Write an enzyme that holds these catalytic residues in place. Structure first.
Site, PDB file in Angstrom:
ATOM      1  N   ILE A   1       0.851  -1.184   0.000  1.00 35.59           N
ATOM      2  CA  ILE A   1       0.000   0.000   0.000  1.00 35.59           C
ATOM      3  C   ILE A   1       0.888   1.236   0.000  1.00 35.59           C
ATOM      4  O   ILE A   1       1.906   1.282   0.698  1.00 35.59           O
ATOM      5  CB  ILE A   1      -0.951   0.001   1.213  1.00 35.59           C
ATOM      6  CG1 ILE A   1      -1.901  -1.191   1.135  1.00 35.59           C
ATOM      7  CG2 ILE A   1      -1.735   1.298   1.285  1.00 35.59           C
ATOM      8  CD1 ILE A   1      -2.916  -1.226   2.238  1.00 35.59           C
ATOM      9  N   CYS A   2       0.501   2.238  -0.788  1.00 32.00           N
ATOM     10  CA  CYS A   2       1.246   3.483  -0.903  1.00 32.00           C
ATOM     11  C   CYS A   2       0.597   4.628  -0.136  1.00 32.00           C
ATOM     12  O   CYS A   2       0.532   5.748  -0.651  1.00 32.00           O
ATOM     13  CB  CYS A   2       1.419   3.871  -2.369  1.00 32.00           C
ATOM     14  SG  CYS A   2       2.936   4.789  -2.686  1.00 32.00           S
ATOM     15  N   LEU A   3       0.100   4.362   1.069  1.00 27.47           N
ATOM     16  CA  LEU A   3      -0.531   5.379   1.900  1.00 27.47           C
ATOM     17  C   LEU A   3       0.411   6.564   2.074  1.00 27.47           C
ATOM     18  O   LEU A   3       1.591   6.377   2.395  1.00 27.47           O
ATOM     19  CB  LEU A   3      -0.907   4.793   3.260  1.00 27.47           C
ATOM     20  CG  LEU A   3      -2.383   4.516   3.529  1.00 27.47           C
ATOM     21  CD1 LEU A   3      -2.522   3.623   4.745  1.00 27.47           C
ATOM     22  CD2 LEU A   3      -3.148   5.811   3.729  1.00 27.47           C
TER      23      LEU A   3
END
Ligand code: AMP
Lengths: 76, 992, 152, 79
Positions: free
Chosen positions: C84-86
């Site tokens: 995930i690229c939060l």
């Protein structure tokens, strides 16, 4: 004898590994048990990298070897 | 760093080093290591015993020989480029005229004045350093007009240019950053990269005016052309001039370098004491006898006799001369110490290089280093003439200052030198000369997991050039045993990290009396400090960067525990964000890491994808094999067959560059317009600070060609075909082929009829083509993966990544990479400077004296911080240990809770009750490492299931491990009911 | 040590779990690994649940936690591996102050409102921005094919 | 209660005029310095007249007169 086997995730899970048995046949089983791609990390003791063509007897795998792996690559 | 302007002048300079005692040997060694072209030594006096306690070049077999001639062999062996010659005559005008620097180390006042006058008369920079016991003295005179060309240890500033408008002020705005505050009015600026304003590049540097809200101006730009975008604005340094009074004049009105006023007064007292010592030496012929009460009284009487009007008339002293200080200096002025020699030689060699290269602000003619704190405290027994009397051993220089008792205490010690890179090697030299563990009841230990490299051996003396490959620990141990024959070094190759906690545990750390950690990271230092706190061991820690230096001591229960900069410790090993990689490397550093990681993922994984994984168990049916093959195969050529063509050409390099920059940017623009966002429609700002353009290659420009060369050479080296450097002929070949792209525009994108390929339109034909390529590569030769090697220049890694970063940053309008960013990168790091390394090693040697001396108050210890470029040195007593308390429990950062187990091993309930009653604290979380043992929010069933068990059994059941054979204590971290999220309770040492 | 802080955070969050997160659990053996069932609100992810795995490195809170979607999830900025690229997790906006509760709230927001600004699956982001109907089709299919049954 | 203007000196030969008060704390001064210079608080300390500055004490104890240069020292890692 017992050799300290540890994972980079914080769990050691020492396994029965002997010098009389080839290191490849044990690392493949360890990788299968863990479930992570071996190409992600290279198993290494005392800082000596392991190669597909590298005799372990030249570097002398010490009992209770400080074998650990370093995360690499960029999955995402 | 390595600046070619200054280094050209460094090699062409000649320096004389007279009076080659220990201090002169230190100065000459530092000059040879830094690479001074010529070095004329001069010391015809025979070698004595007292010279063997500070000077490392002279050995016991060099007794009754000229010091200069004896030291010449080793000094020349240190670095072959330096031509160390020995002059046997006398210091005459003809000799002084030829040299560029002259350093009189430990010479009498008569010779100092004579040579100083002679050198100041014509053109010669003159230094006069001298160490008398525990107090140093340095004088630097560089003539009446010495022009420094770069007065700061900082790269010229740079800032990204946002926009420039025309008009009378010519006001321009720049992107927000720290450089906006850094820039100041009245400065001088230049411009090199800018789209628009063609002839503004390479123009004369111009001044600026700082206005409010970060507004800057250049002048009149109305007459010039239109401006498109701004690359960077670079600051320009202003050469400074210094005039130094000659020695005969400055000796009367000294100008000391200090960071206070009380320290200036202290240095004035020290200067009076040194003048008194010189007058005593002239009136009696002999130096004051070791710790002789009679001689000290004569010296202090001479200090009083020294003219009170000799001092400046515009600022009277608040108090007359410090009799105690003068008496102590006279008493300890017998011998010469090794740490003090290292410190003063470091400073003197830094000044010599300042003079030679016209860089950094030189010293203001006077520096006095005071380290008398290493003497025994007032209450304790001060050394007597009887035990300070010389005997004939190599350590009689140290004896004449400290005493035979202290020498024996130093001899009977066990230490642990963790890390022997550069500071470790010089600390090893200091230890060997001092005598730390040179007896049969003592010893030493060196821990290192590295191997000597051609880059490391550049400015290191313990490591030679014929040792590349052998362990640093073993080589340093051999060198130390060569230095001091009586020493017993035990080289250990295993590192000091949490994995190696079975080798370096209990039994190992029980013998060591102290630890000296010269490490090159923050996490390693924090771990070593944690181990030293756990085992209650003294720790000496040093750290250098450029001309910066820090030396600290952490004695248990007296000084604050070492706390690491956790931010930097985490930053040491941390991945970079991928958003800048994908679409916006806002700075040259993000474009640099993008280039590095793109090359890594394109080459390192290529080797495993061609043969191992494909041939072992998997095929294209894996998660995404076509993408992995596409990122490497087509970009490097269509291939699809065994390449019989030479692997060193330009046909595929240009196609790869097209796909890397031009095709990538065009694809991004097709994905979304550079000015608009499709989803937003009407955003707050349409295209905010993002306007990427596709790049077209120019054969004339150097960056594009250097990238092509680098790619071709690396590809040849990687495929295995012998690659030739294109810089001679194949660069001219790629220039001879100017237009290879127009004939191969369409087909090189994808297959033969895929202008854009739409979405997954490659189909079974392309899938089978990729599978055939994989099979061909599998049956072909295996490509060997390569790692980042700075030492090997032929691989073309640093140049390739720098060129790619510059190309992409210029594509994105980002200012080009500068050398400062590359230096700040962990890779391609410069070696530490020998001067600052020697300085920190000497300060740590002084701390070792204080540690070995015995039980000492905190006020005795000193932490030191220095910056040689600014001549800024501080030695400050450290703080008291922090006192944290919760309720009635009070603790510091060193203490530990020690609960016993009992012959019947107690249970979780027993331990909890013991805590709760004995120390009055209700535990809420009991952790062993990362293993929970007892919470409070735990369900009553879980509490009644875990609590009846015993702690040792519970650790076994949870971890799955077994109690260590020989385990002594178990460390558990405990919390408390109603405690803040910051309070760190002392670790609990369950004594199993 | 970061383990004590992680234990305190988990104990604090268990008494008042967020509505979108259920069975926030961890093994006593290794307390730096949280297992959780993300329960989205906005369809088709609203149908099923996704098991994630939060890992806290020993440098916490100075090193962002690593979140990986163990269950296969159809998100423009979530890779099939589960990464995930939060924005908060990325090492440019991380502060020790920001808590895992806030991180998980941002994760819920991200899952319920697909992101296109930082596409981890640029290919599928392009397919989203072109044919969102085809995207809902594949989203429904992947949810009903891999997603875990939603607990009560 | 009156404010003063000190000159914090950066580690790369630069100075900056901070506007602080004698009733503030070295922690506040460190925060301002960090904010202006893009550095973390735990990575650097700052010294004045040789002696260092504990980040729990008011600046009044340390004798910061107006037009004073408080040096900034970086924690070094190279070995
Ligand atoms: O002089 P320098 O700054 O190059 O010092 C580096 C040396 O320090 C050693 N080192 C670094 N980290 C460790 C640990 N954890 N344990 C033992 N030695 C260590 C390097 O090997 C180098 O010699």
């Amino acid at each position: 004898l017992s050799i300290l086997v540890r994972n980079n995730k914080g769990r050691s899970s020492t396994y029965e590994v002997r010098l009389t048995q080839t290191v490849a046949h044990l690392k493949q089983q360890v990788s299968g048990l863990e479930g992570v791609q071996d190409d992600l990390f290279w198993l290494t003791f005392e800082g000596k990298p392991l190669e597909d063509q590298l005799p372990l007897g030249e570097y002398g795998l010490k009992p209770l070897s400080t074998v650990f792996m370093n995360l690499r690559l960029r999955g995402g | 760093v390595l600046g070619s302007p200054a280094m050209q002048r460094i090699q062409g300079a000649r320096v004389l080093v007279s009076g080659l005692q220990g201090l002169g040997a230190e100065v000459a060694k530092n000059l040879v290591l830094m690479g001074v072209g010529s070095l004329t030594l001069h010391d015809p006096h025979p070698t004595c015993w007292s010279d063997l306690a500070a000077q490392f070049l002279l050995s016991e077999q060099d007794l009754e020989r000229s010091r200069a001639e004896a030291s010449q062999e080793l000094l020349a062996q240190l670095n072959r480029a330096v031509q160390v010659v020995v002059h046997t005559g006398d210091i005459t005008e003809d000799l002084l005229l030829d040299f560029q620097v002259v350093v009189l180390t430990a010479a009498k006042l008569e010779e100092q004045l004579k040579v100083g006058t002679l050198c100041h008369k014509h053109g010669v920079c003159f230094l006069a350093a001298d160490t008398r016991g525990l107090v140093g003295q340095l004088f630097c005179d560089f003539g009446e007009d010495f022009t420094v060309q770069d007065p700061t240890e900082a790269e010229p500033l740079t800032a990204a240019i946002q926009h420039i408008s025309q008009g009378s002020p010519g006001i321009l705005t720049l992107r927000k950053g720290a450089n906006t505050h850094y820039f100041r009015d009245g400065d001088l600026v230049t411009f090199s990269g800018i789209e628009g304003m063609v002839e503004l590049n390479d123009c004369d540097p111009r001044s600026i005016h700082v206005r409010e809200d970060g507004s800057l101006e250049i002048g009149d730009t109305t007459t010039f052309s239109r401006y498109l975008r701004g690359g960077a604005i670079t600051e320009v340094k202003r050469p400074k001039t210094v005039r130094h009074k000659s020695l005969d004049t400055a000796l009367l009105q000294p100008h000391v370098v200090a960071q206070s006023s009380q320290e200036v007064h202290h240095a004035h007292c020290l200067h009076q004491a040194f003048c008194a010592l010189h007058k005593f030496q002239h009136l009696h012929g002999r130096p004051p006898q070791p710790w002789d009460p009679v001689d000290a009284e004569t010296v202090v009487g001479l200090a009083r006799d020294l003219e009170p009007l000799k001092r400046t008339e515009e600022e009277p002293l608040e108090e007359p001369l410090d009799e105690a200080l003068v008496r102590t200096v006279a008493l300890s002025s017998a011998g010469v110490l090794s740490p003090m020699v290292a410190m003063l030689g470091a400073v003197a060699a830094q000044e010599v290089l300042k003079a030679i290269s016209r860089k950094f602000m030189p010293l203001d003619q006077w520096l006095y280093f005071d380290a008398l704190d290493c003497l025994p405290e007032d209450g304790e027994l001060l050394p007597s003439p009887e035990d300070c009397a010389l005997r004939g051993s190599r350590y009689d220089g140290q004896i004449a200052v400290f005493g035979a008792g202290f020498q024996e205490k130093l001899r009977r010690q066990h230490y642990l030198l963790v890390g022997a890179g550069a500071i470790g090697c010089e600390l090893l030299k200091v230890f060997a000369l001092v005598g730390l563990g040179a007896g049969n009841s003592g010893g030493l230990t060196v821990v290192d997991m590295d191997h000597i490299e051609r880059s490391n051996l550049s400015r290191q003396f313990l490591f030679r050039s014929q040792d590349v490959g052998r362990p640093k620990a073993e080589v340093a141990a051999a060198a130390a045993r060569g230095l001091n024959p009586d020493l017993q070094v035990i080289p250990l190759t295993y590192p000091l990290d949490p994995t190696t906690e079975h080798i370096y545990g209990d039994n190992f750390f029980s013998r060591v009396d102290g630890v000296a950690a010269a490490l090159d990271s923050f996490q390693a230092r924090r771990y070593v400090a944690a181990r030293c706190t756990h085992y209650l061991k003294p720790l000496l820690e040093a750290g250098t960067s450029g001309t910066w230096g820090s030396a600290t001591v952490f004695m248990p229960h007296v000084t604050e525990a070492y706390r690491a900069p956790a931010s930097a410790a985490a930053s040491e090993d941390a991945p970079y964000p991928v958003c800048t990689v994908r679409y916006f490397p806002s700075t040259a550093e993000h474009t640099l890491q993008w280039a590095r990681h793109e090359f890594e993922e394109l080459f390192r994984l290529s080797a495993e994808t061609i043969n191992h994984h494909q041939q072992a168990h998997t095929s294209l049916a894996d998660m995404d094999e076509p993408q992995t093959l596409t990122l490497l195969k087509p970009v490097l050529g269509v291939l699809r067959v065994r390449p019989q063509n030479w692997q060193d050409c330009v046909a595929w390099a240009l196609g790869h560059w097209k796909l890397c920059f031009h095709y990538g940017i065009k694809q991004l623009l097709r994905h979304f317009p550079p000015n608009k966002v499709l989803e937003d429609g009407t955003p707050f700002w349409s295209g905010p600070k993002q306007c990427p353009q596709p790049l077209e290659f120019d054969t004339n420009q150097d960056t594009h060609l250097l990238y092509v060369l680098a790619a071709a050479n690396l590809y040849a080296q990687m495929h295995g075909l012998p690659g030739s450097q294109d810089w001679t002929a194949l660069r001219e070949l790629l220039k001879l082929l100017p237009q290879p792209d127009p004939q191969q525009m369409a087909p090189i994108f994808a297959s033969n009829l895929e202008l854009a390929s739409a979405s997954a339109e490659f189909g079974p034909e392309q899938q089978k083509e990729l599978n055939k390529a994989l099979e061909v590569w599998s049956v072909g030769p295996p490509l060997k993966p390569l790692m980042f090697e700075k030492d090997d220049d032929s691989n073309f890694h640093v140049d390739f990544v720098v060129a790619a970063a510059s190309l992409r940053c210029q594509n994105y309008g980002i200012p080009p990479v500068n050398r400062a960013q590359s230096k700040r990168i962990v890779g391609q790091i410069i070696p530490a400077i020998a001067t600052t390394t020697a300085a920190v090693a000497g300060l740590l040697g002084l701390e070792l004296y204080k540690v070995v001396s015995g039980p000492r108050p905190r006020s005795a210890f000193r932490h030191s911080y220095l910056h040689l470029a600014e001549n800024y040195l501080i030695r400050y007593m450290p703080f008291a240990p922090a006192i944290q308390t919760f309720h009635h429990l009070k603790w510091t950062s060193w203490d530990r809770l020690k609960v016993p187990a009992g012959q019947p091993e107690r249970t979780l309930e027993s331990l909890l009750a013991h805590l709760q009653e004995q120390h009055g604290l209700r535990v809420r979380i009991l952790l062993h490492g990362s293993a929970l043992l007892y919470a409070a929010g735990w369900s009553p069933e879980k509490q009644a299931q875990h609590l009846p068990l015993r702690v040792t059994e519970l650790v076994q059941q949870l971890t799955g491990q077994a109690p260590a054979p020989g385990q002594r204590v178990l460390v558990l971290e405990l919390s408390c009911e109603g405690d803040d999220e910051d309070t760190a309770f002392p670790p609990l040492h369950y004594e199993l | 040590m970061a383990s004590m802080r992680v234990v305190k955070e988990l104990e604090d969050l268990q008494k008042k779990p967020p509505p979108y997160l259920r069975n926030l659990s961890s093994d006593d053996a290794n307390v730096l690994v949280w297992h959780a069932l993300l329960l989205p609100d906005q369809p088709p992810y609203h149908l099923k649940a996704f098991n994630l795995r939060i890992s806290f490195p020993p440098e916490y809170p100075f090193k962002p936690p690593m979140i990986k979607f163990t269950t296969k999830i159809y998100h423009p900025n979530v890779d099939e591996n589960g990464q995930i690229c939060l924005p908060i997790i990325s090492s440019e906006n991380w502060k020790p102050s920001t808590k895992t509760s806030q991180v998980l709230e941002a994760l819920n927001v991200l899952v319920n409102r697909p992101n296109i600004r930082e596409p981890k699956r640029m290919d599928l982001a392009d397919l989203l921005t072109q044919n969102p109907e085809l995207f809902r089709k594949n989203a429904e299919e992947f949810t009903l094919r891999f997603g875990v049954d939603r607990p009560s």
